[PDB]
Enzyme design. Structure first.
Site, PDB file in Angstrom:
ATOM      1  N   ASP A  56       0.839  -1.182   0.000  1.00  0.00           N
ATOM      2  CA  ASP A  56       0.000   0.000   0.000  1.00  0.00           C
ATOM      3  C   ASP A  56       0.883   1.244   0.000  1.00  0.00           C
ATOM      4  O   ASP A  56       2.108   1.166  -0.169  1.00  0.00           O
ATOM      5  CB  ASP A  56      -0.937  -0.035   1.215  1.00  0.00           C
ATOM      6  CG  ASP A  56      -0.186  -0.060   2.548  1.00  0.00           C
ATOM      7  OD1 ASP A  56       1.038  -0.265   2.556  1.00  0.00           O
ATOM      8  OD2 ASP A  56      -0.837   0.100   3.603  1.00  0.00           O
ATOM      9  N   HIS A 357       1.708  -9.132  -2.922  1.00  0.00           N
ATOM     10  CA  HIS A 357       0.557  -8.235  -2.791  1.00  0.00           C
ATOM     11  C   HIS A 357       1.107  -6.823  -2.642  1.00  0.00           C
ATOM     12  O   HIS A 357       1.270  -6.301  -1.539  1.00  0.00           O
ATOM     13  CB  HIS A 357      -0.300  -8.659  -1.602  1.00  0.00           C
ATOM     14  CG  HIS A 357      -1.527  -7.828  -1.388  1.00  0.00           C
ATOM     15  ND1 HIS A 357      -1.506  -6.629  -0.709  1.00  0.00           N
ATOM     16  CD2 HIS A 357      -2.822  -8.047  -1.722  1.00  0.00           C
ATOM     17  CE1 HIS A 357      -2.730  -6.137  -0.644  1.00  0.00           C
ATOM     18  NE2 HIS A 357      -3.549  -6.977  -1.253  1.00  0.00           N
ATOM     19  N   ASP A 401       0.816 -18.566  -4.157  1.00  0.00           N
ATOM     20  CA  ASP A 401       1.426 -17.453  -4.878  1.00  0.00           C
ATOM     21  C   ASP A 401       0.385 -16.698  -5.705  1.00  0.00           C
ATOM     22  O   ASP A 401       0.487 -16.573  -6.926  1.00  0.00           O
ATOM     23  CB  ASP A 401       2.588 -17.936  -5.751  1.00  0.00           C
ATOM     24  CG  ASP A 401       3.443 -16.798  -6.263  1.00  0.00           C
ATOM     25  OD1 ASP A 401       3.319 -15.681  -5.724  1.00  0.00           O
ATOM     26  OD2 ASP A 401       4.245 -17.029  -7.198  1.00  0.00           O
ATOM     27  N   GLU A 410       1.517 -11.262   1.305  1.00  0.00           N
ATOM     28  CA  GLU A 410       1.821  -9.939   1.825  1.00  0.00           C
ATOM     29  C   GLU A 410       3.331  -9.704   1.873  1.00  0.00           C
ATOM     30  O   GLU A 410       4.118 -10.632   2.060  1.00  0.00           O
ATOM     31  CB  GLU A 410       1.211  -9.791   3.221  1.00  0.00           C
ATOM     32  CG  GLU A 410       1.557  -8.499   3.981  1.00  0.00           C
ATOM     33  CD  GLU A 410       0.897  -7.256   3.409  1.00  0.00           C
ATOM     34  OE1 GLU A 410       0.765  -7.145   2.179  1.00  0.00           O
ATOM     35  OE2 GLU A 410       0.520  -6.370   4.214  1.00  0.00           O
TER      36      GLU A 410
END
Ligand SMILES: [Ca+2]
Ligand SMILES: [Mg+2]
Length: 433
Positions: A56, A357, A401, A410
């Site tokens: 993020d 991610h 994956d 993550e």
């Protein structure tokens, strides 16, 4: 068996790919550019820089500070390994980035900016950080909005940074130490949980208690200053009776216990350090996957195990259960490097994870569009996020994956923080042996 020099190089590249703000001329991550240049405090204070926390674009001050403290500690203890790998100067440049951000965030003696970015609106976006247009609010802790945990952790990172830099950049290091002292006084005299005062943080990095941060910040300031008042503060808020469950961004217990045992020569805390180590060793209280990963919980098991390996390798350096600590730590790091048949470090080794991610690496090269299509697309992230340690497998060593697996796939600043120091320690043992 594994090229630790390369692992260290790429781990530092992961942190470089997490950089926010105006990037330097020698930026090594080609798909990253300037981003979040408007990050600012309520009176326009420059808050550019720092690291994006994970996949993020929120700047979460609590894990960002803890990652920096842990990285600095490993640079101090395993400098020999970083030096031999050719990565010492790059490691210093790596944490100089966040230390400079903490200085910016400390806008006055008793006000410290602890978050930039609304995690709800940030996580609803999928795209490049360079393309963001949403509002990015900034929140601070202050006497009316205390955060002893965040403030003392940042004080710990600044004191550790003083120790790292004082022999090469005294002006920088002295500034870090001065702000460490001030922020720790702020933490002690304005008491509360930062994620209650910065409520947007509570869904992501909620602090369960701040007393361990107060002992941790005191222990680091005692290492930096050797002033008895800080050792007193460490005993005041530290425990000699409780054993840590984990070493991580929320729980500093075994961190300060080990720091006080080794750096400060205290003996009261050693039994709890040994309890922690034996709890993690084979035959202890942490289950191992069939293929040998110490698996504390589904949430970032690689992070927890790498953090324990880091603690074990600092312990070994000070001749605390050295043989068993080194064997345990090596077994855990080598699991992550590929012992079970695949690497869990992106861009390294055999069949590394292809779908971390992670927004910026999920985007194709500019000027291609990047939006939620790039979240959903079933193939590898277009950019290789070198060095990122993924959350890891389930308790039966399984790993799909998939970018949508927000648990196992993550990546995060704190995931790599103990890991990187542990790798440097293992490189250093190669010099010894
Ligand atoms: Ca805590
Ligand atoms: Mg590319």
């Amino acid at each position: 068996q594994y090229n630790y020099d390369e692992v260290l190089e790429k781990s530092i590249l992961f942190y470089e790919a997490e950089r926010s703000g105006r990037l330097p001329a020698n930026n090594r991550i080609p798909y990253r550019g300037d981003s979040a240049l408007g990050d600012q405090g309520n009176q326009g204070q420059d808050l550019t820089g720092g690291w994006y926390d994970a996949g993020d674009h929120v700047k979460f001050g609590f894990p960002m500070a803890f990652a920096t403290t842990t990285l600095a500690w490993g640079i101090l203890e395993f400098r020999d390994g970083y030096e031999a790998a050719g990565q010492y100067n790059l490691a210093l440049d790596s944490i100089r980035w966040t230390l400079n951000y903490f200085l910016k965030a400390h806008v006055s003696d008793n006000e410290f900016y602890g978050q930039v970015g609304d995690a709800n609106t940030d996580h609803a976006y999928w795209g490049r950080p360079e393309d963001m247009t949403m509002e990015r609010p900034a929140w601070s802790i202050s006497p009316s909005a205390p955060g002893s945990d965040l403030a003392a952790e940042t004080a710990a990172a600044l004191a550790a940074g003083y120790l790292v830099f004082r022999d090469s950049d005294a002006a920088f290091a002295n500034n870090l130490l001065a702000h460490s002292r001030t922020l720790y006084d702020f933490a002690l005299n304005n008491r509360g949980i930062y994620s209650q005062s910065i409520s947007n943080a509570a869904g992501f990095y909620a602090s369960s208690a701040y007393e361990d941060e107060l002992a941790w910040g005191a222990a680091w300031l005692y290492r930096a200053t050797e002033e008895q008042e800080y050792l007193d503060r460490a005993y005041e808020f530290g425990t000699t009776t409780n054993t840590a469950w984990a070493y991580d961004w929320n729980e500093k217990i075994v961190g300060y216990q080990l720091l006080l045992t080794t750096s400060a020569g205290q003996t009261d805390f050693l039994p709890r350090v040994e309890n922690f180590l034996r709890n993690w060793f084979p035959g202890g209280s942490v289950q191992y996957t069939p293929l040998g990963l110490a698996w504390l919980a589904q949430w970032g098991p690689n992070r927890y195990a790498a953090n324990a390996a880091f603690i074990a390798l600092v312990s070994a350096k000070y001749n605390i259960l050295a043989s068993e600590s080194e064997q345990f730590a090596r077994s855990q790091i080598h699991y992550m490097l590929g012992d079970a048949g695949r690497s869990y470090v992106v861009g390294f080794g055999n069949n590394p994870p292809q779908q971390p991610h992670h927004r910026s690496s999920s985007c194709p090269d500019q000027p291609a569009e990047c939006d939620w299509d790039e979240f959903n697309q079933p193939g590898p992230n277009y950019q290789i996020l070198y060095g990122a340690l993924v959350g890891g497998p389930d308790q039966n060593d399984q790993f799909e994956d998939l970018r949508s697996d927000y648990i196992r796939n993550e990546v995060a600043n704190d995931y790599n923080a103990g890991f990187q120091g542990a790798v440097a320690a293992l490189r250093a043992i190669q010099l010894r042996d």
